[PDB]
Amino acid sequence: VNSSVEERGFLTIFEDVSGFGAWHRRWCVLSGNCISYWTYPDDEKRKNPIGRINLANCTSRQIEPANREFCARRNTFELITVRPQREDDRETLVSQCRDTLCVTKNWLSADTKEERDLWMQKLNQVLVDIRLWQ
Numbered sequence: 001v002n003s004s005v006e007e008r009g010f011l012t013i014f015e016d017v018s019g020f021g022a023w024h025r026r027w028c029v030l031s032g033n034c035i036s037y038w039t040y041p042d043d044e045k046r047k048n049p050i051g052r053i054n055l056a057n058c059t060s061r062q063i064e065p066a067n068r069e070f071c072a073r074r075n076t077f078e079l080i081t082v083r084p085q086r087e088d089d090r091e092t093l094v095s096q097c098r099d100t101l102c103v104t105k106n107w108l109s110a111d112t113k114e115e116r117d118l119w120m121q122k123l124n125q126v127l128v129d130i131r132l133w134q
Helices: 113-131
Strands: 007-017 020-031 034-038 051-054 076-084 095-098 101-109
Touching: 007 113, 020 113, 051 076, 076 113
Parallel strands: none
Antiparallel strands: 007 020, 007 101, 020 034, 034 051, 076 101, 095 101
């Protein structure tokens, strides 16, 4: 009876740059069970996203700030996803394949703590929605 959760904002994402790791500012859309991202807002209306993160594959009960053993960047939340490995899966700085299972660690940094907290909240509500249904 209520609408599916949505969120839009810029987030800076840790991405494997064919060798090195680097943070890239992206336009992010939470809709259905995915964060889709583009470089800027306009492009959301003109092309397919650069990537998508599927919350239906999330490992955890809830989304939490990035693990400080590994991530030093402020305002960062962490989303780990897992699924059976495919032909397209490749080892990278954010994705490990072992035992035919691919785990991808997603780090997305907000411009402010308040936006980090907003995103974590919306994403937790998507998790609950994914778990409560037919």
